[PDB]
């Protein structure tokens, strides 16, 4: 259970959580309600594990891509903004928070990666990925390196993998097809091979993570990095003379970065949905609210039309929207967490030389497709299990699930998740239909 008359917010560690807490202080000064902001590790995975048992934050912040899975699991309260509030945010930002025709979260800002470069080490940054090896050889001579970015998260290496034809799923006829997956194609292979070749040629180390790349660029050791708006405030602190520009092209095609919409969703198990709505609509989604988060770690291109009119003057936001128009919006389908686990595995294995590009991507394509196919089976099984009212079959199912041990009894319900059950136990449930 979640405490009443108190709001608890969860947001990622790379976002402006101290600035968000400053907005919670204004909320407390005007209403009396205490607001507590937390930034757990792996919060995208913690939220489904705690919100199922009625615990967790009242508000959760993440990009839109994970919200579809939370909505299908019944974890999110359906937000109902009045017509006049909806006109304050850009229409395409509300589309990213729409699942099954319902609005499941409040859009906050649009993010996309950009090429961030150091003007004192490299005033003319490369326009192509292919000229980075020669540039690195020229920079190493001067005691520096060309490029360093997070190689541990597929979000960062995706601009290059999608450049020549890679894609998450086909969005054929206004609906994503979980069968058509563009990870094994020749465009994705061409992209990831280029990346692996940079590492084999010592132009990059496969062990580079977020922190290593952040410190090397901010200390002046590397000429370029690939990061989002949230990173700008730390670069300012380092006093590095930096620019934010277009991501380089690969095989004449532009790098296609994933575009995410930072969203705030209200937990369905929370008794503070009234306070959460008041906080998000009248405190956070205002020029003053967004400015407090943006001053901590930049949001990018905010969803609020009035505050975006001020930020549009910023050439770093122009670079962000330039890269965002060239990339792809993140799909919001519930098997996106399985898609991400697959691409993350293939990228790391190929980068480290543990698998070839063709082998790594074939396994990713195979797993993403299989995990999505099985999840749709579970969604059809769930729809039929809720239409079931025959107390006889319900008792037989309650008994089969009792044998497995995969269940929990609450004051009013007998709970169990179809995802937690063995693929064998699911086949038994089909026989009951």
């Amino acid at each position: 259970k979640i405490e009443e008359g108190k709001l608890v917010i969860w947001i990622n560690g790379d976002k402006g959580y101290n600035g968000l807490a400053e907005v919670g202080k204004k909320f407390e000064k005007d209403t009396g309600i205490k607001v507590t902001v937390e930034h757990p590790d792996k919060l995208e995975e913690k939220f489904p594990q705690v919100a199922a048992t009625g615990d967790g934050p009242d508000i959760i912040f993440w990009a839109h891509d994970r919200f579809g899975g939370y909505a299908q699991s019944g974890l999110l309260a359906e937000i109902t903004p009045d017509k006049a509030f909806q006109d304050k945010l850009y229409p395409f930002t509300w589309d990213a928070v729409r699942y099954n025709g319902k609005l499941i979260a409040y859009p906050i800002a649009v993010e996309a990666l950009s090429l961030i470069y150091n003007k004192d080490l490299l005033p003319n940054p490369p326009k192509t990925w292919e000229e980075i090896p020669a540039l690195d050889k020229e920079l190493k001579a001067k005691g520096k390196s060309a490029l360093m970015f997070n190689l541990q998260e597929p979000y960062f290496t995706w601009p290059l993998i999608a450049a020549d034809g890679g894609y998450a799923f086909k969005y054929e006829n206004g609906k994503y097809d979980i069968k058509d997956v563009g990870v094994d194609n020749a465009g994705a292979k061409a992209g990831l091979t280029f990346l692996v070749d940079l590492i084999k040629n010592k132009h990059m180390n496969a062990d580079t993570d977020y922190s290593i790349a952040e410190a090397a660029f901010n200390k002046g050791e590397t000429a370029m990095t690939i990061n989002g708006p949230w990173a700008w405030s730390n670069i300012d602190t380092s006093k590095v003379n930096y620019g934010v520009t277009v991501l380089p092209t690969f095989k004449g095609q532009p790098s296609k970065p994933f575009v995410g919409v930072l969203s705030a969703g209200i937990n369905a198990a929370s008794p503070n949905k009234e306070l959460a709505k008041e906080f998000l609509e009248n405190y956070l989604l205002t020029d003053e609210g967004l400015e407090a988060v943006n001053k901590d770690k930049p949001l990018g291109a905010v969803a609020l039309k009035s505050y975006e009119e001020e930020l549009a003057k910023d050439p770093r936001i122009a670079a962000t929207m330039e890269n965002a128009q060239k990339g792809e919006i993140m799909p919001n389908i519930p098997c996106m967490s399985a898609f991400w686990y697959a691409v993350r595995t293939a990228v790391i294995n190929a980068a480290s030389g543990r698998q070839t590009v063709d082998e790594a991507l074939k396994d990713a394509q195979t797993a993403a497709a299989a995990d999505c196919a099985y999840l749709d089976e579970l969604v059809e099984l769930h729809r039929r299990l809720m239409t079931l009212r025959e107390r006889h079959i319900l008792q037989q199912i309650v008994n089969l699930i009792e044998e497995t041990g995969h269940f929990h009894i609450t004051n009013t319900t007998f709970d169990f998740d179809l995802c937690s059950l063995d693929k064998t136990t699911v086949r038994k449930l089909q026989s009951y239909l």
Binding site: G74, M386, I397, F414, D415, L418
Partner: peptide, 5 residues
């Protein structure tokens, strides 16, 4: 997530 009365 399945819940049963």
């Amino acid at each position: 997530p399945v819940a049963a009365p």
